[PDB]
Ligand binder design. Structure first.
Ligand SMILES: CCCCCCCCCCCCCCCCCC(=O)OC[C@H](COP(=O)([O-])OCC(O)COP(=O)([O-])OC[C@@H](COC(=O)CCCCCCCCCCCCCCCCC)OC(=O)CCCCCCCCCCCCCCCCC)OC(=O)CCCCCCCCCCCCCCCCC
Ligand SMILES: CCCCCCCCCCCCCCCCCC(=O)OC[C@H](COP(=O)([O-])OCC(O)COP(=O)([O-])OC[C@@H](COC(=O)CCCCCCCCCCCCCCCCC)OC(=O)CCCCCCCCCCCCCCCCC)OC(=O)CCCCCCCCCCCCCCCCC
Ligand SMILES: CCCCCCCCCCCCCCCCCC(=O)OC[C@H](COP(=O)([O-])OCC(O)COP(=O)([O-])OC[C@@H](COC(=O)CCCCCCCCCCCCCCCCC)OC(=O)CCCCCCCCCCCCCCCCC)OC(=O)CCCCCCCCCCCCCCCCC
Ligand SMILES: CCCCCCCCCCCCCCCCCC(=O)OC[C@H](COP(=O)([O-])OCC(O)COP(=O)([O-])OC[C@@H](COC(=O)CCCCCCCCCCCCCCCCC)OC(=O)CCCCCCCCCCCCCCCCC)OC(=O)CCCCCCCCCCCCCCCCC
Ligand SMILES: CCCCCCCCCCCCCCCCCC(=O)OC[C@H](COP(=O)([O-])OCC(O)COP(=O)([O-])OC[C@@H](COC(=O)CCCCCCCCCCCCCCCCC)OC(=O)CCCCCCCCCCCCCCCCC)OC(=O)CCCCCCCCCCCCCCCCC
Ligand SMILES: CCCCCCCCCCCCCCCCC[C@@H](O)O[C@H](CO[C@H](O)CCCCCCCCCCCCCCC)COP(=O)(O)OCC[N+](C)(C)C
Ligand SMILES: CCCCCCCCCCCCCCCCC[C@@H](O)O[C@H](CO[C@H](O)CCCCCCCCCCCCCCC)COP(=O)(O)OCC[N+](C)(C)C
Ligand SMILES: CCCCCCCCCCCC(=O)SCCNC(=O)CCNC(=O)[C@H](O)C(C)(C)COP(=O)(O)O
Lengths: 88, 140, 175, 122, 347, 115, 54, 49, 98
């Protein structure tokens, strides 16, 4: 059979695993609702790198638009849920 | 091949239960090995370890069925002092069916197998007694 | 046992078969088939079949050349495999070699039956004819009898070759 | 196994040997020939039905050809079948005659001398 | 493809089959098989549609492996006796090799895997050819060497074919795969009686061929390759669906239809050889074939499925090219049982 | 036996020449020296990438034409038979069929390379 | 007052690839309406060669 | 009438009809003669007449 | 039977096992087919030469001819499959199921 019924908790766990795999972020610090700029002191290019890492993790193209807004892990989870059509 | 069949058949029915059970175990193990080979060929196990596990599981299940069938059938033919009776085979068949259910862990499978294997075992005994031919040599 | 020439040639034949049956890159499979073809030509020559051996070697060399050309185009595989570049190919090659050695050992010192019959060895020189006559070659005469005895064979073979040309051109058309 | 392919004196593709002329030909009112003609008529009706033509009355020449072809083939088929059965009987009788020890004539007892078990129904 | 090239390729296929059936030399039989395969490969690819390429590749690989095994069996037989005539195959190992090679050529279980795939991959006309004309040569060879066939191996393969055809047909919604599994089961029925009586084998082959021709021509007339496409035919040609239902009943072996004649004639023969369990198993196993014929009869003729609006357009047009032998095929495949004794003309 | 000796001698001489070629001179092999040659600049792709054959149909036809010469080669011996008329008829038939196959491939553009 | 006949819900059972869908087999898709699959536009790479300067 | 002339119409193809009827009649005559000769030959062989 | 005969028979068996066990390339399987044909040629030639069956000397040559027709056939198919997938891998031949 094909891929299992991925859930929102799976999306959140994968997103946080990817983010904790970034060198410029201390792992224990970041939360789900932590802004990339204000809380973590990242600039736009680091956000671009994080978005590319998300694209590698979940395997679908996120355009330049609809990526300028995914600014904490939480909106990233929302974007992936909307694109993959998951609700529970 | 046919050597295993003659090895089982040469031992008189209600005698030397250990040797009869050993022969039936060998026949069951051979059948399980054939089934494992075909299942591995047509349904790849995606790894060597999982393939070995599947082959061992199938072979052990079939060998256990054969051993239990042979032991119970010989012991029944011995304690009842009535060889050449399909009842012993039916009882042996039921034991194998029960074992199959135990191995697959299902009552439904176990109950169905006990009835079906037992009937088949009894029919094989009847064919042995009356000389029924499965593969009949041409004569006319 | 005398000079072991025929046995050595047959063993190299089997080794080449194992080499191309392990299925490395088709370049090396073609090499193994070429070695087998030359060795089989030698085997046939050792029995008086000069024309047949040379004929099959010449046919195979031409065939292999086409295969090499086709391999460079359709079976290229950026890292081509040699017999020691992969565990599966090396395992198949070693299994073939070991089975050949085991069969030879079982049939050489003892007289064991594998599938059909058994063998004691004795060298293949034993079963020769002793025939002492002729100002011609029996093999050449038999092959040349194709144009006088084998009219039906010539007819069916020619029709098959013409149909083969038509068939390949139909298959490769596409559209 | 094939039982009469290798019968001695058999011509490969004859379909009707000369000796078959010794047999009475099937009558033209043979019920098997009538069934052959009926099969031809049914074929004609089905031909009318598939072609979307009036089934009973569309083509009388075509239906006539169907019936005639079926009867014509069936006549020779019946002749060959009768010949083959006659051959089987001829060979069987000859073999029985030539092997008397294998088919021994047995003197038959009467039911007054044979003892059959009686099984009451109760 | 050019019509002349198509005609010459068809002639080459029939010529290979004829060369197999008229030869007394093993080499000429092998040559006939080679010629048949060579001319058959492009017939399967007449319409390119890459599934046909896959079907042709699978068919070529299977048939070429079988041809290699056949040549090895011939050479072993020659080695153990310097004989080239087709006879009782003096060596038993060669006999086993030839039995397996001919089973692979025919598609008997467990060499049956290629038949559903090849039949689904090719067009309906190619499937008709593959399931009717391709069976003659291996069966003709088997009839000549029947006195030396090991009954155990052949009967095992026949029972496997009947069982596997019956089981495989149950899960199919595609008509061509249904035809392929029917073909496998009928092949098993054909080869079950071969060691006992070759006339029964020929009779079964003829009845199966006429029924298969009827079914394939009916599926060509109404251009349906699936169950749901065939469920639209009642709203365009009810007569075609009715005749299809009758033919499907005949193929299930129901009396008094024609398809009952072979099975009835085989069981009886097998009983004269003291074979009782085997015919009983085969007869009860044929009920699977009957079931998945009856399901198609339900879908196509005995009930009316919903249709589409555009079908109204099709009401205004007639079938242009007509198959002349279809009415005779239907009649022969249904109403023939009373003429059963005519089978004596086959020996 | 003499041909085997000749083959062994030739192969031994060639192998000895290779051995002297590889063991007599002074070797200074570094990565730049052993790099592949493509006229001074580095290759873009691999040399193990597929390379299209534009004469593939001619290549396939070559197999059948090569077996035809194997069929035709026993003609010098065939010309010694008493049934000269039959042998000549069959030889001419074989050559005519070969010529007809060549003509068929030629007319249907089978000898033109793919573009 | 009307004889029951199959509807869309009844007919859809025969529209899949197999009669009895299975966890693994449910991902099988029915063949195209004509037996023509979408052309696999495989990128056949061209060989890139340096001609010169040497 | 019809839009397309429908070339197969009120005038049937008389060549085809004549050929069909001629084939049927020839077959019937041949069968009658064959049965007559078969009966005569059978009676000749068996010494009946 | 001498050792040469069983060596040729073993070569045939090895080539058959090689054909029946696919790895990825169709060309490798076609090479196994050619190898089986070659083993058949050698075996038949040895039998015919040993027994001095003079006419049968034309038989192996004929066996070669229909070998080429099988190779040229197979290669042809290998082209078409390649043109569909850019690769001769046998895993791509899975549009039709059982
Ligand atoms: C008296 C002598 C001995 C008795 C012989 C008669 C009994 C034969 C038994 C046949 C068993 C096969 C089917 C039933 C079990 C289902 C198979 C399975 O995988 O589930 C296992 C099932 C649970 O496993 P699972 O992983 O959960 O299965 C998941 C799905 O359910 C299923 O998973 P899946 O859907 O993925 O299936 C995998 C795949 C795999 O399919 C298979 O398993 C193939 C099995 C067929 C081989 C038949 C073996 C019989 C050989 C007898 C020879 C005797 C020698 C001595 O299935 C297929 O694709 C089959 C498609 C059809 C292709 C057919 C090709 C096979 C060739 C035809 C038969 C070969 C005959 C020999 C050569 C013929 C040449 C002429 O239960 C078992 O583990 C038991 C396995 C075997 C038990 C057999 C019991 C016999 C005991 C012997 C008693 C002797 C007593 C002594 C008396 C004196
Ligand atoms: C006269 C007629 C008779 C002719 C025959 C006589 C022959 C005489 C001479 C024979 C000498 C052979 C010479 C060369 C043969 C060429 C072999 C070849 O080309 O291999 C291709 C074939 C495919 O190559 P590949 O696709 O490139 O490699 C992918 C990996 O193998 C797979 O990647 P993975 O990691 O995903 O999978 C792990 C691996 C692990 O494999 C397994 O799972 C099987 C482990 C079962 C344990 C027992 O493979 C599989 O799970 C797939 C199933 C294939 C297993 C091998 C099938 C053998 C027959 C089936 C019965 C298996 C035993 C059941 C019990 C029966 C009694 C022992 O290789 C294999 O299947 C395995 C190696 C075979 C070497 C042994 C040959 C002997
Ligand atoms: C027109 C004609 C009319 C005829 C047609 C209609 C009549 C025939 C059809 C009706 C009968 C057929 C049913 C047969 C069994 C089917 C079981 C089944 O479907 O499994 C799926 C079903 C699904 O299970 P699952 O979902 O996989 O697992 C969750 C469990 O459900 C939940 O797990 P659980 O914890 O709740 O329960 C599991 C466990 C816990 O059990 C319980 O919770 C409650 C206790 C249940 C069993 C208690 C039996 C012991 C006492 C009964 C003694 C005999 C009756 C009184 C006789 C008086 C004599 C004057 O059960 C056991 O451990 C029992 C294991 C074996 C003990 C019983 C076997 C005794 C053999 C009899 C020998 C007779 C020799 C001849 C004697 C001659 C003199 C009369 O399994 C069950 O739930 C049923 C298990 C109990 C089966 C035994 C009950 C049947 C007793 C008579 C059998 C004989 C009839 C067949 C004859 C041919 C066979 C050789
Ligand atoms: C041992 C038994 C002994 C006796 C054997 C009896 C067996 C039957 C006879 C043999 C086989 C007959 C085959 C030829 C007929 C086929 C043609 C056809 O389709 O019929 C349409 C046609 C009506 O069309 P029409 O009149 O042109 O205009 C209305 C439109 O066509 C309007 O038409 P439409 O197309 O628009 O209507 C649509 C309809 C169209 O669907 C159909 O028409 C169905 C066609 C039947 C299929 C035949 C299959 C092949 C035969 C196998 C039979 C198996 C027998 C074994 C037992 C199992 C029973 C199945 O589709 C549906 O309604 C679907 C309903 C689903 C029901 C499923 C049942 C179908 C199969 C049952 C077959 C039963 C026998 C058929 C009876 C004859 C008809 O029927 C007929 O008029 C012909 C019937 C017989 C002709 C009588 C001429 C003789 C004149 C008197 C001579 C006197 C004799 C003595 C002389 C001396 C006296 C003084
Ligand atoms: C035990 C006793 C019982 C024995 C039982 C025997 C077996 C029973 C039957 C077996 C199963 C039958 C299966 C039939 C396969 C049909 C396949 C097919 O053609 O397509 C299906 C076809 C397709 O339908 P469609 O979709 O409407 O057509 C669209 C087109 O296909 C669209 O394609 P197109 O646009 O390209 O159209 C071209 C079209 C139009 O055609 C044309 O335009 C004609 C133009 C002429 C071209 C010039 C060519 C000349 C140059 C070539 C030379 C080649 C030489 C080869 C020899 C080499 C020698 C080594 O041509 C065709 O469609 C096919 C042409 C067929 C030619 C047949 C020639 C027979 C060859 C015989 C060879 C044997 C020689 C002796 C051997 C000696 C040994 C070596 O459907 C049917 O044909 C309906 C089925 C009819 C089958 C016959 C029914 C049973 C037979 C009853 C007759 C009596 C038999 C007993 C007689 C006993 C002796 C008197
Ligand atoms: C569905 C019913 C079957 C339909 C079959 C097609 C119907 C059309 C008829 C076919 C015409 C061809 C036969 C007539 C031409 C002459 C035949 C002759 O040249 O050949 C003879 C052969 O004649 C044929 O065998 C007889 C053909 C008769 C076919 C009808 C039998 C059908 C079975 C009974 C079912 C009832 C159906 C009746 C029609 C409705 C030579 O015999 P022989 O070479 O030595 O044996 C070959 C087989 N051996 C060697 C292995 C033994
Ligand atoms: C024309 C065709 C026919 C010719 C017939 C003659 C065939 C000649 C064989 C072909 C080889 C020619 C090579 C000539 C130079 C010798 C190279 C090598 O053998 O010498 C050194 C061999 O010495 C090794 O370093 C190890 C020496 C000892 C260890 C193993 C040898 C053990 C033998 C025991 C010796 C003790 C005394 C024996 C007295 C008999 C390896 O040095 P190396 O730098 O790599 O190679 C480059 C050579 N350079 C420097 C000249 C450019
Ligand atoms: C293997 C090694 C190869 C090396 C190759 C090097 C390739 C060189 C490519 C050079 C291309 C350019 O400079 S592109 C020119 C880039 N210059 C600007 O954008 C001017 C305005 N700067 C800003 O807006 C921010 O400081 C910004 C830094 C963008 C952060 O953006 P965010 O606020 O949104 O995070």
């Amino acid at each position: 059979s094909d891929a299992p019924p991925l859930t929102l908790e799976a999306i959140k766990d994968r997103v946080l695993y990817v983010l904790k795999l970034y060198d410029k972020i201390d792992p224990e610090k970041l939360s789900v609702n932590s802004h990339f700029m204000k809380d973590l002191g990242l600039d736009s290019l680091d956000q671009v790198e994080i978005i590319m890492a998300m694209e590698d993790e979940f395997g679908f193209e996120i355009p330049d638009i609809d990526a300028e807004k995914l600014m904490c892990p939480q909106e990233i989870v929302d974007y992936i849920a909307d694109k993959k059509d998951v609700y529970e | 091949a046919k050597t295993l069949l003659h090895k089982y058949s040469d031992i008189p029915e209600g005698t030397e239960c250990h040797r009869k059970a050993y022969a039936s175990t060998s026949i069951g193990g051979a059948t399980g090995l054939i089934v494992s080979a075909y299942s591995i060929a047509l349904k790849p196990p995606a790894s060597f370890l999982e393939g070995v596990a599947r082959t061992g599981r199938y072979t052990f299940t079939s060998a256990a069925i054969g051993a239990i069938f042979g032991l119970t059938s010989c012991i029944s033919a011995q304690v009842r002092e009535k060889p050449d009776d399909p009842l012993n085979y039916f009882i042996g068949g039921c034991a194998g069916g029960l074992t199959l259910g135990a191995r697959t862990r299902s009552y439904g499978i176990g109950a169905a197998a006990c009835a079906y294997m037992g009937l088949t075992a009894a029919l094989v005994k009847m064919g042995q007694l009356e000389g029924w031919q499965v593969f009949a040599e041409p004569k006319v | 046992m005398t000079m072991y020439i025929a046995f050595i040639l047959s063993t190299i034949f089997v080794i080449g078969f194992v080499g191309f049956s392990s299925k490395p890159s088709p370049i090396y499979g073609g090499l193994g088939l070429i070695v087998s073809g030359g060795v089989g030509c030698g085997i046939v020559l050792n029995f008086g079949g000069s024309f047949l051996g040379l004929m099959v070697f010449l046919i195979y060399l031409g065939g292999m050349l086409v295969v090499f050309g086709y391999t460079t185009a359709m079976a290229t595989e950026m890292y081509p495999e040699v017999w020691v570049s992969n565990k599966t190919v090396f395992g198949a090659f070693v299994s073939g070699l070991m089975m050949e050695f085991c069969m030879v050992y079982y049939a050489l010192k003892e007289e064991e039956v594998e599938i059909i019959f058994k063998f004691n060895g004795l060298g293949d020189w034993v079963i020769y004819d002793t025939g002492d006559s002729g100002f011609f070659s029996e093999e050449a005469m038999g092959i040349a009898a194709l144009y006088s005895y084998g009219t039906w064979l010539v007819i069916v073979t020619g029709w098959s070759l013409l149909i083969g040309v038509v068939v390949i051109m139909e298959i490769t058309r596409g559209n | 196994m094939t039982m009469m392919s290798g019968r001695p004196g058999r011509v490969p593709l004859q379909f009707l040997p000369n000796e078959a002329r010794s047999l009475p030909p099937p009558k033209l009112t043979d019920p098997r020939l009538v069934y052959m003609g009926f099969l031809g008529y049914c074929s004609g009706l089905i031909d009318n039905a598939i072609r979307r033509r009036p089934v009973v009355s569309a083509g009388l020449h075509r239906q006539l050809l169907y019936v005639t072809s079926f009867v014509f083939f069936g006549y020779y088929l019946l002749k060959r079948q009768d010949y083959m059965y006659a051959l089987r009987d001829h060979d069987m009788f000859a073999y029985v005659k030539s092997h008397p020890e294998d088919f021994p004539e047995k003197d038959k007892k009467t039911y007054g001398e044979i003892l059959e078990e009686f099984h009451p129904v109760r | 493809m050019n019509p002349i090239i198509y005609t010459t390729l068809i002639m080459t296929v029939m010529s290979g089959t004829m060369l197999v059936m008229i030869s007394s030399h093993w080499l000429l039989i092998w040559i006939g098989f080679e010629m048949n395969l060579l001319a058959m490969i492009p017939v399967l690819m007449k319409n390119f549609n890459p599934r046909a390429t896959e079907a042709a590749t699978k068919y070529f690989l299977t048939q070429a492996t079988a041809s290699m095994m056949l040549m090895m069996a011939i050479i072993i037989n020659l080695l153990y006796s310097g004989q080239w005539t087709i006879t009782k195959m003096f060596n038993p190992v060669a006999m086993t090799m030839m039995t397996m090679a001919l089973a692979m050529k025919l598609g008997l279980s467990p060499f049956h895997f290629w038949v559903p795939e090849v039949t689904q991959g090719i067009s309906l006309q190619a499937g008709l050819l593959l399931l009717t004309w391709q069976k003659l040569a291996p069966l003709s060879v088997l009839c000549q060497i029947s006195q030396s066939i090991n009954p155990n191996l052949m009967l095992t393969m026949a029972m496997l074919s009947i069982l596997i055809g019956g089981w495989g047909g149950l899960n199919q919604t595609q008509l061509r795969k249904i035809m392929a599994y029917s073909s496998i089961a009928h092949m098993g029925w054909m080869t079950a009686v071969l060691p006992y009586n070759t006339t029964m084998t020929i009779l079964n082959l003829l009845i199966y061929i006429t029924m298969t021709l009827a079914m394939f021509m009916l599926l060509i007339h109404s251009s349906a390759t699936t169950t749901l496409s065939l469920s639209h035919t009642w709203n365009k040609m009810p007569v075609i669906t009715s005749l299809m239902m009758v033919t499907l009943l005949s193929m299930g072996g129901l009396p008094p239809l024609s398809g009952f004649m072979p099975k009835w004639m085989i069981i009886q023969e097998m009983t004269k050889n003291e074979s009782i369990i085997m015919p009983t198993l085969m007869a009860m196993t044929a009920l699977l074939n009957l079931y998945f014929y009856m399901r198609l009869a339900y879908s196509s003729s005995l009930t009316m499925f919903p249709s589409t609006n555009n079908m109204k357009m099709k009401w205004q047009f007639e079938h242009t090219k007509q198959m002349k032998l279809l009415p005779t095929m239907i009649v022969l495949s249904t109403l023939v049982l009373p003429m059963t004794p005519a089978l004596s003309s086959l020996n | 036996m003499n041909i085997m000796l000749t083959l062994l001698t030739n192969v031994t001489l060639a192998s000895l020449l290779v051995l002297i070629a590889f063991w007599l001179p002074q070797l200074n092999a570094y990565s730049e020296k052993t790099s592949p040659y493509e006229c001074g600049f580095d290759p873009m792709g691999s040399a193990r990438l597929p390379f299209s054959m534009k004469f593939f149909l001619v290549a396939i036809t070559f197999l059948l034409f090569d077996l035809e010469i194997a069929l035709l080669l026993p003609l010098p011996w065939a010309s010694q038979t008493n049934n000269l008329k039959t042998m000549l008829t069959m030889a001419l038939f074989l050559l005519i069929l070969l010529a007809a196959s060549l003509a068929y491939e030629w007319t249907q553009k089978g000898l033109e390379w793919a573009e | 007052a009307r004889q029951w006949q199959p509807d869309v819900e009844w007919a859809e059972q025969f529209g899949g690839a197999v009669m009895y869908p299975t966890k693994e087999t449910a991902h099988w898709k029915p063949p195209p309406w004509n037996d023509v699959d979408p052309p696999k536009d495989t990128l056949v790479s061209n060989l890139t060669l340096n001609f010169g300067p040497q | 009438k019809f839009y397309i002339r429908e070339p197969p119409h009120g005038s049937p193809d008389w060549l085809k009809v004549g050929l069909t009827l001629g084939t049927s009649v020839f077959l019937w005559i041949y069968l009658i003669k064959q049965h007559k000769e078969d009966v005569l030959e059978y009676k000749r062989r068996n010494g009946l007449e | 039977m001498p050792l040469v005969y069983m060596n040729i028979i073993m070569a045939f068996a090895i080539a058959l096992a090689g054909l029946l066990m696919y790895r990825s390339h169709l060309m490798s399987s076609l090479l196994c087919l050619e190898g089986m044909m070659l083993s058949l040629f050698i075996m038949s030639t040895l039998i015919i030469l040993n027994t001095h069956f003079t006419l049968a000397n034309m038989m192996p040559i004929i066996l070669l001819v229909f070998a080429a027709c099988e190779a040229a056939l197979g290669l042809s198919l290998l082209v078409m499959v390649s043109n569909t997938y850019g690769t001769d891998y046998v895993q791509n031949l899975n549009l039709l199921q059982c």
